[PDB]
């Protein structure tokens, strides 16, 4: 009797992404879990043309 009742609307991927941020730093890379956070260059989205 399977005990994993998973719904069609919950999001167990986004939840885990959010959970790690509140559990740690999400800045330093961890190779094992392949947890390099997806990010962009701060000064290439908001290009500051000095």
């Amino acid at each position: 009797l399977n005990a994993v009742v998973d719904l069609q609307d919950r999001n167990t991927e986004l939840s885990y992404q959010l959970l790690l941020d509140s559990l740690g730093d999400r800045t330093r890379y961890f190779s094992m879990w392949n947890s390099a956070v997806d990010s962009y260059d701060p000064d290439v989205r908001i290009i500051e043309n000095h």
């Binding site: 009797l1 399977n2 005990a3 994993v4 009742v5």
Partner: protein, 53 residues
């Protein structure tokens, strides 16, 4: 031996034996432990609880 064991009959090799004289296998009563609660799972399911396992 025959007196001691054989069933007294009026006819050697009867064509059919009465229920009384035939060895009957009588097992003990079989007890079953019902796993679920009939009413409880109805109350929980109607609530919104989603049972499993």
């Amino acid at each position: 031996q025959a007196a001691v064991t054989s069933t007294p009959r009026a006819k050697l090799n009867p064509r059919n034996w009465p229920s009384t004289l035939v060895y009957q296998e009588i097992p003990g009563p079989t007890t079953v432990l019902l796993p679920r609660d009939a009413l409880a799972e109805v109350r929980m399911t109607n609530s919104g609880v989603q049972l499993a396992g």
